[PDB]
């Protein structure tokens, strides 16, 4: 079981997915094309600003 | 739920097109089947019907 956990901008959570690229797709986070599982977010601004 | 096809996709989740026929051979007044051409009846001689 792979787990792990970070924070960025709201602007780039739609681009976590694999085909995407750009700012947080090429210069942060990549994820194989073949990839298989879940994704999980939620809004956390009243504890993280 | 939906679908989200997209042509950047890789093969294995690009959408196909499927069409599957369905045939019964059972003992009933055929009524469709493939191109040839019939011959007189004979009969009382050893035939190959």
């Not at chain 1, 079981?1 to 700012?23: K, L, M």
């Amino acid at each position: 079981v792979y787990a792990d956990s970070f924070v960025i901008r709201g602007n780039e959570v739609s681009q976590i997915a694999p085909g995407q690229t750009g700012n947080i797709a090429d210069y942060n986070y990549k994820l194989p094309d073949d990839f298989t599982g879940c994704v999980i977010a939620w809004n956390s601004n009243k504890l993280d600003s | 739920r939906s679908y989200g096809f997209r042509p950047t996709y890789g093969v294995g989740h690009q959408p196909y097109r499927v069409v599957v026929l369905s045939f019964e051979l059972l003992h009933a007044p055929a009524t469709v089947c493939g191109p040839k051409k019939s011959t007189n009846l004979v009969k009382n001689k050893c035939v190959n019907f």
